[PDB]
C-alpha cells in the first residue's frame, strides 16, 4: 500500500463522491477529518460508512477496531485479516489520489529554483514547480553534473505530459515513470534521483523557518508522513502466539530486525535506536513483563531509564509499578532491584536504584531512572523549557558514566512521547557538539527513526513541538 489511498485536502462530501463516482464496492480511502482525527471512508452495497480513528498522541485508535502504529499498518492488517472490521466491512481497493502537496518533489508556486537547485543541490536534484509562463502547466528542473535543465509539463484534459509519449492522471505517475525511464536529451539523461533538499537548514536560520512555517507544518508534517508505506518491515516475533500477552497492544509490534533479543524465552517489545548515544524505545511494563523488561536493562548495560508517562492516566493504566518504593527491596525474576534515594524536582522524580543478579554479586550497578510527570494528557507541553532541561540533565547523567549502555526510553505504547524525546535529544547532540555552524534536518531524521521503530512521533502537535524544543535551545545558548 503505497499511501496513495490518503487523500491530504479532501472533505468528507467530496470523499462520498469519490467512492460513489469512481469506485465500487470494497473501495476505501483514508483522509484527516477535530484537528488530530482522521476518517476511515469505505464503500459497500453502494452506501459510504465513515469510520472514525483517533489519535491523541500515543496510536491511531480506529473506532470498534484495534489499535495501530501507523495509518499504513492499519490498511496492511484489514487488507489481510478479512472478518475484523465490523455487519463485515472489507477493504478491497484503494482509491487513489492525484493530490501532488504532500510529494516531496513538488514545490507549487517558486520562481524560476535555480538558485535553490545550484546552493543546495546535487546531480540527479529535482523538483516540480507550476508554470510561470503559461498558468495550470508545471514545470520539472533537474540538476545534473553542472547545469539545471528544464522540462516542461503540459496540462491538457485533466492529463499530463512532457511533449509526446504517454498522458498521466497524476504528476506523481508522471514523476514516478520517468524516474525509473528517464528522459535522454537529444545529445544527456535527466536522472531523477532524489527530490531537492529544501528542509536541511542551518541551525543559526531555524527561527527564521519557523516563522515561515508558522504562517506550513501540516504541510510538511503530511510530506513525511506518505513516505511511511517504505517502513513496512516485518513484526513476525511479535505476531508469534508464546509472545501474544507480552505485548501492551497486540497489533503495535516491534521490527524484527531492530528488536531486543534477551539471552537468559527471547522477546520483548523493544528496539534499538542507533542515530556516540544509542537509545532502546520500548513500551510500559506489563505485570507479567516486568521480570523481562529487567532482564533487557542489565544485558544491555543500561544505567538510564527515561519514563514520560504517569502509572495511571485519564483512569487508563500506562505503566505497572517495575521499581520498588523508597528504600524497599524487590526480586523481579533473577534479578535483584533496590530503591536507594528519590530526589523529586517539579516535571520529574529521579529515582536511583541499583540493579543487580540474583547469587551474583559484583553484577551491581546503578541504574538512574528519570520519570517526567508533568505532561499533559492531551497534546503535548506550550513551553519546551521543561523538557529541554529534563533531558539536559539526562545528558549529563549519561556522560558520567563509562561504558554505559544504551538509554531507555518508554512510555504507554513507545513509539508517540518515546518519538519525540529521542529525537528531540538526537537533534540537540548535534547542537551541543557541533556549535551553531551544523546542519539540522528535522524530517530526516524522523524518518530515520521510524525505520527502526514502528510510529515514532505521532502527532503533528508532537512534530511542531520538536521544531519549537531546537528553536528554544537554540535561543538560550
Ligand atoms: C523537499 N521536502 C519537502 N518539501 C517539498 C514539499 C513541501 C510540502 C512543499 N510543498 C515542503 C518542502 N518536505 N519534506 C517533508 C519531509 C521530507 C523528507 C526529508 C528527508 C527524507 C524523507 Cl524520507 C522525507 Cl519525507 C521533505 C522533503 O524532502
Not at 5 to 18: K, Q, R
Not at 95 to 102: E, K, R, Y
Request: aromatic share 10%; glycine share 8%; hydrophobic share 35%.
Amino acid at each position: 500500500t503505497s499511501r496513495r489511498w490518503f487523500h491530504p485536502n479532501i472533505t468528507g462530501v467530496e470523499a462520498e463522491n469519490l467512492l460513489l463516482t469512481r469506485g465500487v464496492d470494497g473501495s476505501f480511502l483514508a483522509r484527516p477529518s477535530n484537528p488530530g482525527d482522521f476518517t476511515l471512508s469505505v464503500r459497500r452495497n453502494g452506501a459510504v460508512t465513515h469510520i472514525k480513528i483517533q489519535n491523541t498522541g500515543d496510536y491511531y485508535d480506529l473506532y470498534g477496531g484495534e489499535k495501530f502504529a501507523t495509518l499504513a499498518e492499519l490498511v496492511q492488517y484489514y487488507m489481510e485479516h478479512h472478518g475484523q472490521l465490523k455487519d463485515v466491512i472489507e477493504l478491497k481497493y484503494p482509491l487513489n489520489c492525484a493530490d501532488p502537496t504532500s510529494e516531496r518533489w513538488f514545490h507549487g508556486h517558486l520562481s524560476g529554483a535555480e538558485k535553490l537547485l545550484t546552493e543546495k543541490g546535487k546531480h540527479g536534484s529535482f523538483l516540480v514547480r507550476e508554470s510561470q509562463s503559461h498558468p495550470g502547466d508545471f514545470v520539472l528542473s533537474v540538476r545534473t553534473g553542472s547545469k539545471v535543465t528544464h522540462v516542461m509539463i503540459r496540462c491538457q484534459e485533466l492529463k499530463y505530459d512532457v511533449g509526446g509519449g504517454e498522458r498521466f492522471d497524476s504528476l506523481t505517475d508522471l514523476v514516478e515513470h520517468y524516474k525509473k525511464n528517464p528522459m535522454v536529451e537529444t545529445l544527456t539523461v535527466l536522472q531523477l534521483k532524489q527530490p531537492l533538499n529544501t528542509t536541511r537548514i542551518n541551525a543559526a536560520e531555524i527561527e527564521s523557518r519557523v516563522r515561515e512555517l508558522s504562517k506550513g507544518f501540516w504541510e510538511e508534517f503530511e510530506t513525511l508522513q506518505q513516505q511511511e508505506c517504505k517502513l513496512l518491515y516485518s513484526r513476525k516475533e511479535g505476531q508469534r502466539q508464546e509472545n501474544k500477552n507480552k505485548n501492551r497492544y497486540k497489533n503495535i509490534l516491534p521490527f524484527d530486525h531492530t528488536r531486543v533479543v534477551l539471552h537468559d524465552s527471547d522477546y520483548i517489545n523493544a528496539n534499538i535506536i542507533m542515530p556516540k548515544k544509542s537509545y532502546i524505545a520500548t513500551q510500559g511494563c506489563l505485570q507479567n513483563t516486568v521480570n523481562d523488561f529487567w532482564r533487557m536493562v542489565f544485558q544491555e548495560n543500561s544505567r538510564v531509564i527515561v519514563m514520560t508517562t504517569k502509572e495511571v492516566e485519564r483512569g487508563k493504566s500506562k505503566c505497572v509499578k517495575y521499581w520498588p518504593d523508597e528504600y524497599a527491596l524487590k526480586e523481579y525474576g533473577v534479578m535483584r532491584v533496590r530503591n536507594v534515594k528519590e530526589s523529586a524536582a517539579h516535571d520529574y522524580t529521579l529515582r536511583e536504584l541499583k540493579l543487580s543478579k540474583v547469587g551474583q554479586g559484583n553484577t551491581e550497578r546503578t541504574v538512574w531512572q528519570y520519570h517526567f510527570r508533568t505532561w499533559p494528557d492531551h497534546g503535548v507541553p506550550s513551553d519546551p523549557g521543561g523538557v529541554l532541561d529534563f533531558l539536559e540533565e539526562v545528558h549529563h547523567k549519561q556522560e558520567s558514566i563509562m561504558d554505559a549502555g544504551p538509554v531507555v526510553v518508554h512510555c504507554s505504547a513507545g513509539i508517540g512521547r518515546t518519538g519525540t524525546f529521542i529525537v528531540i535529544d538526537i537533534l540537540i547532540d548535534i547542537i551541543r557538539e557541533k556549535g551553531v555552524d551544523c546542519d539540522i534536518d528535522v524530517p530526516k531524521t524522523i524518518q530515520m527513526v521510524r525505520s527502526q521503530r514502528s510510529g515514532m512521533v505521532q502527532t503533528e502537535a508532537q512534530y511542531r513541538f520538536i521544531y519549537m524544543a531546537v528553536q528554544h535551545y537554540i535561543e538560550t545558548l
